[PDB]
Amino acid sequence: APGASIFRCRQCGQTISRRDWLLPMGGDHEHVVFNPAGMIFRVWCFSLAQGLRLIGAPSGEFSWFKGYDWTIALCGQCGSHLGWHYEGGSQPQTFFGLIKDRLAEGPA
């Protein structure tokens, strides 16, 4: 009976990811970053996620991860901005960077 297995959208409960799917990019699953508007994000990298809606086409502009282009990832249910999908890179080609305080962790 693990209580810390699944990540859900904090705003609505949509199923998003799993602790088992955390990915240590450059040796750490956690990356703390700022956007050009100075907003700080505590980003957890995941190999896999579900329940999102990826908006638009990828952009390399101000990518926090060398070699990757990003797309905005909304909660597919409620539209909350949960993070970004990264693509176009190498080892791995793709991953998700999700904003940890916009998720809730809980049982399977």
Could you list the residues that contact ligand A1IXA (CB under 6 A)?
35-36, 61-64, 70, 84
15 binds Zn ion, rule: CB under 5 A: no
Omega into 92 within 30° of 0, i.e. cis? Answer: yes
CB of 54 to ligand A1IXA, least distance (A): 13
CA dihedral 49, 3, 10, 101 (to 10 degrees): -80
77 binds Zn ion, rule: CB under 5 A: yes
Question: Residues at the annotated binding site?
Answer: 9, 12, 28, 30, 75, 78
How far, in Å, CA of 17 to CA of 32, rounded?
Answer: 19
71 binds Zn ion, rule: CB under 5 A: no
75 binds Zn ion, rule: CB under 5 A: yes
Planar angle of CA 25, 30, 34, nearest 5 degrees: 100
The pair of structure tokens assigned to 51 is 């329940």
Among 15, 47, 71, 80, binds Zn ion (CB under 5 A): 80
CB of 14 to Zn ion, least distance (A): 5
